């Protein structure tokens, strides 16, 4: 994926509710630093739904590709109210961006 295009998607569609930087603040949604390789519902200090907490998958490319296409479908009960990203390449670019940004 194209990290620069993914950053732009992040800003447009996610940044209203999420930060990515280490030590970044929780907002409507959790800070996302350290997301990759982590169980659902584990950002310290954020109050998740039981659904988010109990989904019982590990975040990575494959699970993010599915989740971000249709959040409610993947995690019924979630309080992330977001329509999803329809286009595969946009999801790929966004996830490439997140893989970098949530690690650095
Ligand atoms: C507010 C209107 C949000 C928008 C826009 C996006 N997200 Fe979100 N996200 C939000 C909430 C309130 C939550 C917690 C949901 C719950 O049921 O507790 C989340 C959760 C996530 C997660 C899961 C995090 C985990 O630790 O398990 C991911 C990976 C996530 N959100 C990513 C994400 C992206 C990439 C977005 C734009 C495409 C996005 N979210 C939008 C609130 C909101």
From Swiss-Prot:
Residue positions, PTM N6-acetyllysine: 72, 99
Molecular-function annotations in GO: electron transfer activity; heme binding; metal ion binding
InterPro entries: Cyt_c-like_dom, Cyt_c-like_dom_sf, Cyt_c_1A/1B
Binding site for heme c: 14, 17-18, 80
Effect of residue 14 to S: Decreased covalent heme attachment
Outcome when changing residue 10 to Y: No effect on covalent heme attachment
Record's keyword terms, sorted: Acetylation, Apoptosis, Disease variant, Electron transport, Heme, Iron, Metal-binding, Mitochondrion, Phosphoprotein, Respiratory chain, Transport
Keyword Heme annotated: yes
Predominant subcellular localization, coarse grouping: mitochondrion
GO cellular component, one term: nucleus
Disease implicated: Thrombocytopenia 4: A form of thrombocytopenia, a hematologic disorder defined by a decrease in the number of platelets in circulating blood, resulting in the potential for increased bleeding and decreased ability for clotting.
UniProt similarity note: Belongs to the cytochrome c family.
Protein's name in the database: Cytochrome c
Native source organism of the sequence: Homo sapiens
Gene name in the database record: CYCS
């Amino acid at each position: 994926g194209d990290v620069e295009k993914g950053k732009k998607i992040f800003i447009m569609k996610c940044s209203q509710c999420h930060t990515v930087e280490k030590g970044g603040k929780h907002k409507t949604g959790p800070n996302l630093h350290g997301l990759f390789g982590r169980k659902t519902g584990q950002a310290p200090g954020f109050s998740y739904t039981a659904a988010n907490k109990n989904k019982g998958i590990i975040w990575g490319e494959d699970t993010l590709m599915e989740y971000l296409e249709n959040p409610k479908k993947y995690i019924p009960g979630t309080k992330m109210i977001f329509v999803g990203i329809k286009k595969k390449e946009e999801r790929a670019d966004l996830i490439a961006y997140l893989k970098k940004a949530t690690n650095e």
